[PDB]
Design a protein around this ligand. Structure first.
Ligand SMILES: OC[C@H]1O[C@@H](O[C@@H]2[C@H](O)[C@@H](O)[C@H](O)O[C@@H]2CO)[C@H](O)[C@@H](O)[C@H]1O
Length: 138
């Protein structure tokens, strides 16, 4: 049980083989979830399930640099369901963040922010009950 929005420090930033695991349950009538891997004020990797964008469900991924959002990458495969427990695993690989939900590969996001060791915080927000947020090296 954790308070949302939740900040998970990532000491010394991220590095390949680092696995971040988030467990929670989507609230009924959820509108959004967001993971924000941050480098100071910049967002290296924004992972944003949207439950009702023009009556469609979509995951939007992007990067924010100097307060400007870049080119969105959109995934219509949408494994989250209102009211249900989920597990998000984010594995840092040399060229991308690799995301699996409920043990199924979902998407990859190529590193736009190159200074991995400066991506030192993960913000977790949105319409969830957050159970746990942790990391380990695999
Ligand atoms: O790109 C991720 C980013 O999207 C933002 O959406 C705003 C605006 O609300 C939309 O109407 C428009 O399509 O895009 C802009 C900027 O990209 C949203 O506000 C942020 O929270 C992020 O999800």
């Amino acid at each position: 049980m954790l308070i949302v929005p939740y900040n998970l420090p990532l000491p010394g930033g991220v590095v390949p083989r680092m696995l971040i695991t988030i467990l929670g349950t989507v609230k009924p009538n959820a509108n959004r979830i967001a993971l924000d891997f941050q480098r100071g004020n910049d967002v290296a990797f924004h992972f944003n399930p949207r439950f009702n964008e023009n009556n469609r469900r979509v995951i939007v991924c992007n990067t924010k640099l100097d307060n400007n959002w870049g080119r969105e990458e959109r995934q219509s495969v949408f494994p989250f369901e209102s009211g249900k427990p989920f597990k998000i695993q984010v594995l840092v690989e040399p060229d991308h963040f690799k995301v699996a939900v409920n043990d199924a590969h979902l998407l990859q996001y190529n590193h736009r922010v190159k200074k991995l060791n400066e991506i030192s915080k993960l913000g977790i927000s949105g319409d969830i009950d957050l159970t746990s947020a942790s990391y380990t090296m695999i």
